Ligand binder design. Structure first.
Ligand SMILES: CCCCCCCCCCCCCC(=O)SCCNC(=O)CCNC(=O)[C@H](O)C(C)(C)COP(=O)(O)OP(=O)(O)OC[C@H]1O[C@@H](n2cnc3c(N)ncnc32)[C@H](O)[C@@H]1OP(=O)(O)O
Ligand SMILES: Cc1nn(C)c(C)c1CCOc1c(F)cccc1-c1ccc2c(c1)c(CN(C)C)nn2C
Ligand SMILES: [Mg+2]
Length: 382
């Protein structure tokens, strides 16, 4: 409708037909040197996530105050080591871990982050940032703190000479460049139904539901194994080639591919397929992100795996994704989550995913381009 903060920003208007490609406003040769002012009694604090205490403050802020589902029944519970993986990739900067503290008690009440990313958007590649983990404490909601955090990260990114950003959100803002539905594949239906993430079809009993969701105990594809250090270059080569077919994608160096894919227990899993010749031809990956089951007496945490990047050249994608489900089930996950981006629509129904109840919107800051279908979005943010 109208957007008091967003209408002031270099982004297209909702329902502006965009034909051109490029920035919304010219690049700045003078940047504001003073931080934006917070309301009385609050202060900025850049968070040193290498200090275990401070990282545990951020873990607690997000565990108590970050994204919930539409029913206010589940809340993300990013672990401390996951936060390090997501917030310290190659090129991370300390001033881009932007905290807000109560001056008197020092309590952490706000956060926003930027990390650097090279982004391929249609026929342009540009150095941008990815914005994530914007959070204001429940007690501070609806006081227009969020646009101060957004302006302040913007200023800190401008100081580094960067004028574009990419970000996702559940809410509709001016103006999505793509819209993706999330979908969910049940791995432990009795639990999912007990905690009311899922319901039992009116037309299926529990016994039938367990059989419907049952998977084999070991993956089908020959030569599947975890990614090792020797696979970093071929994973990088495969992913670079595979991404060319999408219109919004990252461009990762070999060091960024090692950061984002080399396995870390309970954070990131990557498995490659190594054929009879010793060549790696395919890989699957998914990250670990549990959700707190709010106010529930029994089950406290929902264990969820999320589809990350899956590259196929010799193994059909259908089988690579069946493999990912099997591996997730083996590792104790309750549910396997995926978006309808890249070629995912080719497998979601076939593999018994059910559609969820919302959208994840994709956005660029200060770049106008035409919007794209979900199938052409080739970028996954944590
Ligand atoms: C060149 C560099 C550029 C870098 C910057 C690029 C842009 C980055 C943008 C950030 C990308 C974030 C990526 C992620 O992390 S998405 C994850 C966002 N986090 C959560 O959903 C956690 C739970 N919720 C919260 O912590 C608060 O509800 C948040 C902080 C989300 C809003 O706090 P609060 O509810 O207390 O609101 P307010 O009164 O202070 O502010 C109201 C204003 O804020 C606009 N709003 C509300 N939600 C969002 C949102 N998710 N993206 C952008 N704008 C949002 C809203 O339309 C209104 O603007 P307008 O309608 O008046 O215009
Ligand atoms: C389980 C569960 N626990 N909670 C607390 C929720 C919301 C679910 C639903 C999770 O739905 C997704 C999925 F199935 C696959 C891929 C992405 C998602 C998703 C959706 C909305 C999302 C995100 C990520 C992110 C994280 N980041 C910015 C991408 N922010 N918001 C607003
Ligand atoms: Mg607020």
């Amino acid at each position: 409708r109208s957007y008091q903060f967003w209408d002031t920003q270099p982004v297209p208007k909702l329902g502006e037909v965009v034909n051109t490609h490029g920035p919304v406003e010219p690049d700045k040769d003078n940047i504001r040197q003073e931080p934006y002012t917070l309301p009385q009694g609050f202060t900025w604090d850049a968070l040193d996530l290498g200090d275990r205490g401070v990282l545990k403050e951020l873990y607690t802020l997000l565990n108590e105050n970050y994204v919930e589902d539409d029913d206010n029944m589940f809340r993300f519970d990013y672990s401390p080591e996951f936060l390090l993986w997501a917030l310290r990739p190659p090129g991370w900067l300390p001033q881009w871990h932007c905290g807000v503290r109560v001056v008197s008690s020092r309590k952490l009440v706000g956060f926003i982050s930027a990390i650097p990313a090279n982004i391929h958007i249609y026929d342009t590649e540009k150095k941008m940032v990815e914005i994530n983990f914007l959070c204001v404490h429940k007690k501070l909601r609806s006081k227009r703190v969020a646009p101060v955090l957004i302006r302040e990260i913007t200023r800190r990114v401008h100081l580094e000479g960067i004028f574009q950003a990419v970000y996702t959100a559940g809410v509709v803002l001016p103006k999505p460049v793509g819209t993706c539905r999330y979908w969910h594949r049940s791995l432990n239906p009795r639990k999912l139904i007990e905690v009311k993430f899922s319901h039992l079809s009116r037309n299926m009993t529990m016994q039938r539901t367990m059989k419907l969701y049952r998977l084999p105990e070991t993956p089908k594809t020959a030569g599947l194994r975890p990614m090792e250090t020797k696979d970093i270059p071929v994973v990088h080569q495969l992913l670079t080639r595979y991404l060319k077919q999408f219109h919004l994608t990252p461009v990762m160096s070999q060091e960024e591919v090692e950061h984002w894919f080399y396995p870390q227990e309970n954070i990131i899993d990557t498995f490659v397929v190594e054929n009879a010749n010793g060549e790696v031809t395919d890989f699957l990956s998914f990250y670990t992100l549990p959700s707190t089951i709010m106010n529930h007496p029994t089950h406290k945490s929902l264990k969820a795996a999320y589809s990350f990047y899956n590259v196929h050249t010799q193994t059909p994608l259908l089988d690579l994704m069946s493999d990912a489900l099997v591996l997730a089930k083996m590792k104790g996950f309750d549910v396997f989550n995926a978006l309808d981006l890249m070629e995912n629509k080719t497998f979601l129904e076939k593999l018994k995913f059910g559609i969820g109840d919302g959208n994840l919107q994709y956005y660029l800051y200060n770049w106008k381009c035409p919007s794209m279908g979900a199938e052409k979005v080739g970028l996954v943010l944590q």
